[PDB]
Write an enzyme that holds these catalytic residues in place. Structure first.
Site, PDB file in Angstrom:
ATOM      1  N   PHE A   1       1.466   9.894   3.098  1.00  0.00           N
ATOM      2  CA  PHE A   1       1.816   9.764   4.518  1.00  0.00           C
ATOM      3  C   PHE A   1       2.456   8.425   4.911  1.00  0.00           C
ATOM      4  O   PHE A   1       3.141   8.340   5.928  1.00  0.00           O
ATOM      5  CB  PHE A   1       0.595  10.056   5.420  1.00  0.00           C
ATOM      6  CG  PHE A   1      -0.609   9.184   5.147  1.00  0.00           C
ATOM      7  CD1 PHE A   1      -0.653   7.866   5.594  1.00  0.00           C
ATOM      8  CD2 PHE A   1      -1.727   9.704   4.500  1.00  0.00           C
ATOM      9  CE1 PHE A   1      -1.789   7.082   5.399  1.00  0.00           C
ATOM     10  CE2 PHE A   1      -2.868   8.933   4.305  1.00  0.00           C
ATOM     11  CZ  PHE A   1      -2.900   7.618   4.754  1.00  0.00           C
ATOM     12  N   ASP A   2       2.264   7.391   4.094  1.00  0.00           N
ATOM     13  CA  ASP A   2       2.823   6.067   4.387  1.00  0.00           C
ATOM     14  C   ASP A   2       2.833   5.190   3.146  1.00  0.00           C
ATOM     15  O   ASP A   2       1.884   5.205   2.371  1.00  0.00           O
ATOM     16  CB  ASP A   2       1.995   5.376   5.479  1.00  0.00           C
ATOM     17  CG  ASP A   2       2.692   4.153   6.082  1.00  0.00           C
ATOM     18  OD1 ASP A   2       3.882   3.895   5.794  1.00  0.00           O
ATOM     19  OD2 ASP A   2       2.049   3.465   6.897  1.00  0.00           O
TER      20      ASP A   2
ATOM     21  N   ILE B   1      -8.674  -0.107   9.861  1.00  0.00           N
ATOM     22  CA  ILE B   1      -9.865   0.721   9.666  1.00  0.00           C
ATOM     23  C   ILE B   1     -10.927   0.071   8.766  1.00  0.00           C
ATOM     24  O   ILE B   1     -10.604  -0.621   7.796  1.00  0.00           O
ATOM     25  CB  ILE B   1      -9.498   2.116   9.088  1.00  0.00           C
ATOM     26  CG1 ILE B   1      -8.675   1.965   7.807  1.00  0.00           C
ATOM     27  CG2 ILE B   1      -8.717   2.917  10.116  1.00  0.00           C
ATOM     28  CD1 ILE B   1      -8.231   3.281   7.209  1.00  0.00           C
TER      29      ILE B   1
ATOM     30  N   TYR C   1       0.795  -1.224   0.000  1.00  0.00           N
ATOM     31  CA  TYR C   1       0.000   0.000   0.000  1.00  0.00           C
ATOM     32  C   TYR C   1       0.829   1.277   0.000  1.00  0.00           C
ATOM     33  O   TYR C   1       1.966   1.300   0.473  1.00  0.00           O
ATOM     34  CB  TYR C   1      -0.971   0.021   1.187  1.00  0.00           C
ATOM     35  CG  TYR C   1      -0.318   0.312   2.520  1.00  0.00           C
ATOM     36  CD1 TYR C   1      -0.143   1.626   2.970  1.00  0.00           C
ATOM     37  CD2 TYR C   1       0.196  -0.720   3.299  1.00  0.00           C
ATOM     38  CE1 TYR C   1       0.540   1.895   4.150  1.00  0.00           C
ATOM     39  CE2 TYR C   1       0.878  -0.460   4.479  1.00  0.00           C
ATOM     40  CZ  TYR C   1       1.050   0.843   4.895  1.00  0.00           C
ATOM     41  OH  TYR C   1       1.758   1.078   6.048  1.00  0.00           O
TER      42      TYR C   1
ATOM     43  N   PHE D   1      -5.964   5.257  -0.637  1.00  0.00           N
ATOM     44  CA  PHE D   1      -4.942   4.217  -0.598  1.00  0.00           C
ATOM     45  C   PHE D   1      -4.815   3.521  -1.945  1.00  0.00           C
ATOM     46  O   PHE D   1      -5.815   3.147  -2.560  1.00  0.00           O
ATOM     47  CB  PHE D   1      -5.270   3.176   0.477  1.00  0.00           C
ATOM     48  CG  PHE D   1      -5.017   3.646   1.886  1.00  0.00           C
ATOM     49  CD1 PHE D   1      -3.776   3.448   2.487  1.00  0.00           C
ATOM     50  CD2 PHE D   1      -6.047   4.196   2.642  1.00  0.00           C
ATOM     51  CE1 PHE D   1      -3.568   3.782   3.832  1.00  0.00           C
ATOM     52  CE2 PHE D   1      -5.846   4.533   3.985  1.00  0.00           C
ATOM     53  CZ  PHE D   1      -4.605   4.322   4.578  1.00  0.00           C
TER      54      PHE D   1
ATOM     55  N   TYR E   1     -10.571   7.622   9.996  1.00  0.00           N
ATOM     56  CA  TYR E   1     -10.185   8.158  11.334  1.00  0.00           C
ATOM     57  C   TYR E   1     -11.109   9.214  11.944  1.00  0.00           C
ATOM     58  O   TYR E   1     -10.787   9.802  12.986  1.00  0.00           O
ATOM     59  CB  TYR E   1      -8.748   8.663  11.308  1.00  0.00           C
ATOM     60  CG  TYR E   1      -7.734   7.572  11.100  1.00  0.00           C
ATOM     61  CD1 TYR E   1      -7.520   6.594  12.080  1.00  0.00           C
ATOM     62  CD2 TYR E   1      -7.083   7.435   9.881  1.00  0.00           C
ATOM     63  CE1 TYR E   1      -6.686   5.506  11.838  1.00  0.00           C
ATOM     64  CE2 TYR E   1      -6.244   6.349   9.631  1.00  0.00           C
ATOM     65  CZ  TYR E   1      -6.055   5.387  10.613  1.00  0.00           C
ATOM     66  OH  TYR E   1      -5.258   4.297  10.349  1.00  0.00           O
TER      67      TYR E   1
END
Ligand SMILES: CCO[C@H]1C[C@@H]2CC[C@@H](C)[C@@](O)(O2)C(=O)C(=O)N2CCCC[C@H]2C(=O)O[C@H]([C@H](C)C[C@@H]2CC[C@@H](O)[C@H](OC)C2)CC(=O)[C@H](C)/C=C(\C)[C@@H](O)[C@@H](OC)C(=O)[C@H](C)C[C@H](C)/C=C/C=C/C=C/1C
EC number: 5.2.1.8
Lengths: 107, 94
Positions: free
Chosen positions: A36-37, A56, A26, A99, A82
């Site tokens: 962010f990741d 999530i 991912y 994502f 979130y």
């Protein structure tokens, strides 16, 4: 909810079952494309067991409808991610997340 | 009471990650983790505590350091670096 947009097709029959371990790559980003990741930045896949609330809701429902080999684009509402609090210092309040996730294999 | 370090760290890390990631409780995260780091500090007294220490000891001590850095900096990035190391040891304990 969560929207699933196919980037590269999977085999169309091998889907994940509850309790199976999903192995994915991912890259996550805010809806404006800010990353962010990413597991690809680390060269090592991400594993999580489906239907255990490890991740999530948007991932749980989005990945459930992917088949092995498939690379999809998950657009996730703040409700399935979130929420109003977000994640302090990382994900802002009420954030829609995007994502890029590829389902590599099932275990 | 008597507990295997293998088991102690497994349930400890599960609890800490629930509190931080699930409940946004960073104070509570520190509550559960600090005792486990204190146990490591007195040192291994059995063969099973010695082998656990040889395998996972450096990683846990480094993670404590990233927690320590967070404490001074306020940089949430330092806490994530701690949890990268915690996740690593956890998935090997399992
Ligand atoms: C290096 C730092 O990296 C973090 C992940 C980062 C944090 C911030 C996020 C922007 C992100 O960058 O991920 C990110 O891209 C992203 O949002 N992800 C991660 C990839 C899957 C989707 C989503 C996610 O659900 O994250 C989630 C999200 C943050 C919290 C989830 C959300 C759903 C809730 O039901 C659950 O409540 C508890 C908590 C984090 C995870 O995927 C990790 C693996 C799993 C958990 C923590 C919990 O399931 C926990 O339960 C007690 C466990 O059972 C785990 C296995 C026990 C062990 C000890 C904990 C290991 C910790 C691993 C932490 C990491 C790799």
């Amino acid at each position: 909810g969560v929207q699933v947009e196919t980037i590269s097709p999977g085999d169309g029959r091998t889907f994940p079952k509850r309790g199976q371990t999903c192995v994915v790559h991912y890259t996550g980003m805010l809806e404006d494309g800010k990353k962010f990741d990413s597991s690809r930045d680390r060269n090592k896949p991400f594993k999580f067991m489906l239907g255990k609330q490890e991740v999530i809701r948007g991932w749980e429902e989005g990945v459930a409808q992917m088949s092995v080999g498939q690379r999809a684009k998950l657009t996730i509402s703040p409700d399935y991610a979130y929420g109003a609090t977000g994640h302090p210092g990382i994900i802002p309040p009420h954030a829609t997340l995007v994502f890029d996730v590829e389902l590599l294999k099932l275990e | 009471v008597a507990i295997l370090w293998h088991e102690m760290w497994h349930e400890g890390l599960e609890e800490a990650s629930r509190l931080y990631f699930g409940e946004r409780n960073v104070k509570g995260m520190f509550e559960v983790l600090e005792p486990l780091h204190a146990m490591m500090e007195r040192g291994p007294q059995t063969l099973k505590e010695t082998s656990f220490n040889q395998a996972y000891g450096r990683d846990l001590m480094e993670a404590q350091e990233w927690c320590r850095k967070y404490m001074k900096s306020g940089n949430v990035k330092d806490l994530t670096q701690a949890w990268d190391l915690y996740y690593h040891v956890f998935r090997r304990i399992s």
